[PDB]
């Protein structure tokens, strides 16, 4: 499912991320953004031989199970393909326990380089939340 900008905010504060762990909302949807562009079917394999999967790349040598990552730990107790879905419940639940783990947001490359210290307000502007 590639979600709308707006769609995405209001679901994920109806997940409760907005302020979870003191990020915003914006800041969710920026690294949305970027990470997969809004589509929850990404894919991305990196060269350690692990893939990223969904709206926020969870990576699969430490947070999800895909059967193809010697090693893999599986932290959020899932199968990869689980967040894949239309539905972002799982997506949701895995990033909560990745941002509680010490980097914070920073764990996401991409949010590090492309909206940290951005005004990621600009996000959720003129959704109705």
Same mark, same amino acid.
């Given at each position: #499912? ?26 969710? &949807?920026? +690294?949305? #953004?970027?990470?997969? =562009?809004?589509?929850?079917? +990404?894919? =991305? ?16 040598? %430490? %947070? ?5 990552t010697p090693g ?17 419940? +799982?997506? $949701? ?5 990745? $941002?509680?783990?010490? =980097?914070?947001?920073? +764990?996401? $490359?991409? %949010?590090?380089?492309?909206? #940290?210290?951005?005004? &990621? ?9």
């Amino acid at each position: #499912k590639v979600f709308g900008r707006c769609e995405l905010a209001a679901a994920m504060k109806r997940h409760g991320l907005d302020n979870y762990r003191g990020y915003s909302l914006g800041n969710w &949807v920026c +690294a949305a #953004k970027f990470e997969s =562009n809004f589509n929850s079917q +990404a894919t =991305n394999r990196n060269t350690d031989g692990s893939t990223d999967y969904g709206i926020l790349q969870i990576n699969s040598r %430490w %947070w999800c199970n895909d059967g193809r990552t010697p090693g893999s730990r599986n932290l959020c107790n899932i199968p990869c393909s689980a967040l894949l879905s239309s539905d972002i419940t +799982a997506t $949701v639940n895995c990033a909560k326990k990745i $941002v509680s783990d010490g =980097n914070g947001m920073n +764990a996401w $490359v991409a %949010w590090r380089n492309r909206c #940290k210290g951005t005004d &990621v307000q600009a996000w959720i502007r003129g959704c109705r939340l």
